[PDB]
């Protein structure tokens, strides 16, 4: 467990601002509903494990020591998404948006396309 606060996420996701048409308040909203802002969120559900603040699965995007069938499109080890530096997470997230789009994150369409004003930080 290692969470950031809304305002910290707003500071650390600065590169994604505008990328793929998605604003910062959408990403701040999306990520709360995706991982609670916890950089070491790990969720195994059935056939895949999902890592970090962005919940990137070891199925298509990264290499996992316990799943050799991965496509590893991000060409990285999934554990590098469990640390405190979101620099590479952001790189992976740009490849996902290139290939799949922001709808990889279900909270976006469901809870974060409307009324983004509460997700603001002038702090
Ligand atoms: Ca990282």
Solved with: X-ray
Contact predicate 85/97, CB 8 Å: no
Q: Nominal resolution in Å?
A: 2.3
Cα–Cα distance for residue pair 64/34, rounded to 1 Å: 20
Domain of 48 in residue numbering reads as 1-123
Ramachandran sector of residue 20 (left: φ over 0; alpha: ψ -120 to 50; beta: rest): left
**Spatial separation of the C-alpha atoms in residues 38 and 89, rounded to whole Å:** 13
- Compute, in degrees rounded to 10, the torsion defined by CA atoms 20, 95, 52, 63: 170
Residue in the structure block whose two tokens are 């056939």: 47
104 touches 93 (CB < 8 A): no
The span from the CA of 10 to the CA of 38, in Å, is 14
CATH of the domain at 47: 1.10.530.10
Residues flagged as binding site for Ca(2+): 80, 83, 85, 88-89
**How many structural domains are present in the chain?**
1
Separation of CA 91 and ligand 1 centre (Å): 10
Name the helix (H) or strand (E) containing 88. helix 87-99
Q: With CA atoms as reference, report the closest residue to 13 among 44, 52, 41, 48.
A: 52
Alpha carbon of 111 to ligand 1 centroid (Å): 26
């Amino acid at each position: 467990m290692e969470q950031l606060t809304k305002c910290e996420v707003f500071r650390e996701l600065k590169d994604l601002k505008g990328y793929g048409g998605v604003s910062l308040p959408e990403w701040v909203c999306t990520t709360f509903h995706t991982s609670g802002y916890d950089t070491q969120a790990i969720v195994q559900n059935n056939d895949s494990t999902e890592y970090g603040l962005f919940q990137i699965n070891n199925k298509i995007w990264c290499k996992d020591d316990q799943n050799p069938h991965s496509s590893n499109i991000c060409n990285i080890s999934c554990d590098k998404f469990l640390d405190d530096d979101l620099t590479d997470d952001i790189v992976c997230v740009k490849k996902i948006l290139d290939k799949v789009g922001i709808n990889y994150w279900l909270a976006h369409k469901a809870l974060c396309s409307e009324k983004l004003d509460q997700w603001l930080c002038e702090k």
